[PDB]
Scaffold this active site. Structure first.
Site, mmCIF file in Angstrom:
data_model
loop_
_atom_site.group_PDB
_atom_site.id
_atom_site.type_symbol
_atom_site.label_atom_id
_atom_site.label_comp_id
_atom_site.label_asym_id
_atom_site.label_seq_id
_atom_site.Cartn_x
_atom_site.Cartn_y
_atom_site.Cartn_z
ATOM 1 N N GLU A 34 1.199 -0.756 0.394
ATOM 2 C CA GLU A 34 -0.173 -0.272 -0.269
ATOM 3 C C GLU A 34 1.033 1.100 -0.046
ATOM 4 O O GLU A 34 0.420 2.352 -1.082
ATOM 5 C CB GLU A 34 -0.846 -0.533 1.203
ATOM 6 C CG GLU A 34 -2.590 -1.338 1.129
ATOM 7 C CD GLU A 34 -1.456 -2.125 1.358
ATOM 8 O OE1 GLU A 34 -2.659 -2.867 2.549
ATOM 9 O OE2 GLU A 34 -0.058 -2.551 2.239
ATOM 10 N N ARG A 79 3.316 -1.830 15.906
ATOM 11 C CA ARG A 79 1.997 -1.874 17.400
ATOM 12 C C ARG A 79 3.187 -0.752 18.124
ATOM 13 O O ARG A 79 2.290 -0.202 18.993
ATOM 14 C CB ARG A 79 1.033 -2.449 17.007
ATOM 15 C CG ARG A 79 2.118 -3.752 17.967
ATOM 16 C CD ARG A 79 1.295 -4.624 17.889
ATOM 17 N NE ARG A 79 1.705 -5.920 18.415
ATOM 18 C CZ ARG A 79 2.005 -6.985 17.916
ATOM 19 N NH1 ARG A 79 1.974 -6.619 16.290
ATOM 20 N NH2 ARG A 79 2.514 -8.334 17.996
ATOM 21 N N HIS A 131 -23.209 9.814 23.971
ATOM 22 C CA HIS A 131 -24.943 10.432 22.973
ATOM 23 C C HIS A 131 -25.010 8.565 21.893
ATOM 24 O O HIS A 131 -26.188 8.744 20.846
ATOM 25 C CB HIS A 131 -24.527 11.094 22.428
ATOM 26 C CG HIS A 131 -25.114 12.469 23.533
ATOM 27 N ND1 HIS A 131 -25.373 12.670 23.763
ATOM 28 C CD2 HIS A 131 -23.309 13.157 23.768
ATOM 29 C CE1 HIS A 131 -25.130 13.648 24.749
ATOM 30 N NE2 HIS A 131 -24.076 14.407 24.877
#
Lengths: 549, 549
Positions: free
Chosen positions: A211, A266, A382
């Site tokens: 990529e 990571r 919310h």
């Protein structure tokens, strides 16, 4: 050995048989001092783990499990640079990335401290040139936008960290991040950019990542079409280890900043992968960032297990996952700047501990790594707290918050503080999740009787609250390190290898194999299964390729 | 009645006892045609649900459960406008929002079709003025940025939908979205904006929402400080129902676009809440968006259960959740523009079905609503698929993809297609998740024997693939509606009320009560529990307030 067969494990099973259905209201009634005593103050973090379904006895039993798993030995072994990444036979030394200059560390014949700071100095020097304007584009202008190109560990960090420390961007240069191989990513991010004032950071250890190099080459064409072929050298730098691919991509080899095999993707943001961050906040602030990791490293290594933050938190996570069957944990930072924090933790935690194999290679006998998910506070509130409160799922929750705001605004009457509004939610939500509200308590409110049941809040939904003093580079570093070490403790207990990631290889090679199928002339042969067979055919017709098929 | 006590439910339990451990490799070996037959083509969607742990018998048994739950009756009752939102006694008519102008619908004495299109026309007219430049700022300029202010249903939609249809922004006006009460949100979003060219959409039904009105008032001060007091009327419009709060906020009352009690917040994006979208893509494209919902509505209402997409998908979800104990479902759109889609679905699904109460008010006997989470494809792939593949968790997965790209780029050799690169992953991942790879198959690769176990891919990880023809406004509408109706079918089966959200009230009132505690002069009285007691005190000291405490 199998941790699930040890006395410590059985003792915890029996303990769960007793307190597994006990409510937090009772936990607190029986243990008045827990609010003060089940906390750890470390660095700029106040960590309150008292709203959890645990007694003092639970904590001791959990700590017993940790000791029988040899947590402390393994921890020391990591810092020292032994090859605890068994499946790949290599060291795990992200912790070395944030060691002071004067630190002593030699591993496998490498002086890692010297190697680390050499790169940091080189980044500091390159980055200083950008921020001062000594570095200019192919036409005469200064760089005002840095755009990072990478995937996974080479993207999630740089993005989260840029957004988190947005307030500290002080050199008038901004950053963007291009990760998806979906061309829409590159096209949207470059749309309004002047190539003369734009510089690219292409981040990949091999410099062969599909990529990333595909994105990078397209960006290069965009840059060259505008500024000419020789312009590459002052609009492209590399975070990589491969000198021969970087050149001959067109990048000057001394504009290549390296990092080592013992730092996992990571776990890489505090390495040269953080180049974009250093660009916008400066080498000094970057150093404060590293220092925050180190504070927590120091604490992880020296504190007794009874007062050891990442260990206690890791163990509590395991308690819910392995003994209550909770499949996930939610992380809820009350800070818009930390909006990409939960997505960062997803890779850290799930790519580390999403395993079915022990370090030796034998099959696990119990669940391993939890699903991590969340959204910043007062958005998530919310969106999905309805389920947190009245749902049927146990989801241990981490509330992260900051006492002091960076900037503040008054409330709607022109007094007070929006930040205090934010934080009133931060404190109330955990309180409400823990203790809930009964039918009797709702009926006393005046609610119509037939509506009462729908309003009942069963509670017993546990949480850790982490109250940092202020959002600073150091504090961000402290938070990341805090989670890195929780991941470590859960991994060691399960006896898995949390520093490899074999599970992604097959997907890559299978995509390479399927590409000619969806791309080539003429109808594809029968595929491995009727689903991909039907899907590939529909794909062909839909892309305008199956006229004649 | 309790769905868990019915024969259909027991039949499914017994069925699970038989096939619960069967592998997808065997499912496919026994059922060669499933790849073609367990699919539904509807609108522009190709939906392949064959990679699931189901036989044809499973599907029939699941459909039996649906019928005993009276799915079709309840469905008709929703469309008709009966009050299926029992706890609040109101209609549920988001489906009415996308009805053609010529549609016939009268409910409770209201002609909703006429009311709906009246608002849509008013939005079309207002929005046309913005896009043409007939509407100008308080100084003479045209509006180039619209900034939406809202939370929850008034934010997640507008943001996801703007990003998804980014390619269709054609009037040179962009949008931004300010939801958090953390002041960092407003401050970051307004930083580089010219007040003269900026217009605010303040979205809230009551126009009393704490975050929204607080954000809106601060924005008003920013606007007024720059452009003067009378400037409000041409830089602020409202999506609300409260004419008397809108004025006297300073907003001209005919610049107030309404929506009704029978549209829930998490179902509101195709209403006036979509004003910002209509602003950037136009009333015509907005109408195509609504039309896409309607296609799926039409299909949901008329198709037999055996071929009914949202029903089959909902039922399959329930199969895993209630009979396999899967706590979560992951949604993975292979499209950078759809990056906020999973976050949108989080509210839709979890706020709807995160319930512990049946519609009557009796307690549920089984799990209700799953945790939904995900990230766009080829980002998530590098973040958490490790766990999807080699983890210990069952996470049914929805792959969403588009055959035709909107814009495309060549690969790194200057030929081919980045979009085809993207999609090769899309097809391979589901294939690999389903069928995996054995020790024997890995050993045949040449892998060292002792490494083999770490590479084993157990598979049996199920997925739906949704292959849309192209990302268009209509297709987006189709996808949203598809999920809205899955949520509906799972809710009806469980017998819950998936259109209320009582679980959020207490958190709000408790935050209001805790505010004076963290804000007022002098030390707070003993709090309800020692955890919030300790936290509030630490908060005070840290904000510079506890000198003397």
């Amino acid at each position: 050995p199998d941790i699930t067969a040890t006395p410590a494990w059985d003792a915890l099973a029996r303990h769960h048989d007793q307190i597994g259905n006990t409510h937090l209201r009772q936990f607190f009634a029986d243990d008045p001092g827990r609010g003060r005593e089940l906390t750890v103050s470390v660095g700029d973090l106040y960590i309150d783990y008292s709203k959890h379904r645990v007694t003092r006895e639970t904590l001791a039993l959990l700590i017993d499990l940790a000791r029988t798993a040899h947590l402390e030995e393994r921890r020391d072994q990591m810092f020292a640079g032994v090859h605890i990444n068994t499946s790949e036979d290599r060291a795990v030394l992200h912790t070395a990335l944030r060691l002071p200059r004067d630190a002593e560390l030699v591993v496998d014949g490498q002086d890692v401290v010297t190697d680390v700071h050499a790169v940091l100095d080189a980044m500091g020097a390159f980055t200083d040139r950008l921020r001062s304007g000594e570095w200019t584009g192919a036409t005469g202008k200064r760089i005002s936008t840095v755009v990072n190109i990478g995937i996974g560990g080479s993207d999630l960090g740089p993005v989260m960290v840029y957004q988190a420390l947005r307030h500290y961007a002080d050199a008038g240069i901004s950053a963007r991040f291009v990760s998806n191989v979906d061309p829409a990513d590159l096209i949207a991010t470059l749309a309004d950019l002047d190539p003369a004032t734009t510089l690219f950071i292409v981040a990949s250890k091999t410099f062969s990542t599909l990529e990333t190099l595909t994105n990078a080459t397209a960006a290069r064409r965009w840059l060259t079409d505008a500024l000419g072929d020789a312009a590459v050298s002052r609009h492209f730098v590399a975070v990589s280890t491969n000198k021969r691919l970087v050149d001959d991509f067109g990048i000057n080899t001394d504009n290549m900043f390296g990092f080592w095999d013992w730092v996992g993707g990571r776990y890489s943001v505090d390495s040269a992968i953080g180049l974009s961050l250093m660009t916008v906040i400066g080498r000094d602030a970057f150093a404060d960032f590293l220092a925050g990791f180190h504070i927590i490293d120091r604490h992880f290594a020296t504190a007794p297990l009874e007062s050891n933050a990442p260990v206690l938190l890791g163990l509590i996570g395991l308690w819910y996952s392995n003994f209550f069957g909770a499949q996930s944990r939610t992380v809820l930072p009350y800070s818009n700047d930390l909006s990409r924090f939960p997505a960062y933790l997803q890779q850290l935690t799930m790519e580390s501990n999403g395993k079915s194999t022990r370090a030796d290679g034998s099959p696990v006998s119990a669940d391993t790594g939890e699903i991590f998910w969340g959204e910043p506070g007062t958005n998530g509130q919310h969106a999905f707290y309805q389920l947190l409160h009245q749902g049927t799922r146990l989801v241990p929750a981490d509330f992260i918050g900051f006492a002091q705001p960076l900037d503040d605004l008054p409330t709607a009457e022109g007094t007070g503080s929006m930040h205090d509004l934010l934080m009133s939610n931060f404190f109330a939500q955990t309180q409400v999740l823990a203790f809930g509200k009964t039918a009797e308590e709702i009926a006393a409110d005046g609610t119509p009787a037939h509506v009462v049941a729908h309003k009942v809040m069963p509670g017993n939904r546990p949480s850790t609250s982490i109250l940092a003093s202020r959002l600073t580079p150091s504090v961000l570093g402290q938070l990341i390190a805090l989670y890195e070490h929780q991941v470590f403790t859960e991994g060691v207990v399960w006896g898995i290898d949390s520093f490899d990631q074999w599970g992604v290889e097959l997907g890559k090679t299978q995509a390479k194999a399927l590409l000619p199928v969806i791309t080539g002339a003429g109808s594809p042969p029968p595929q491995s299964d009727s689903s991909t067979d039907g899907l590939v055919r529909r794909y062909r017709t839909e892309r305008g390729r199956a006229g004649l098929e």
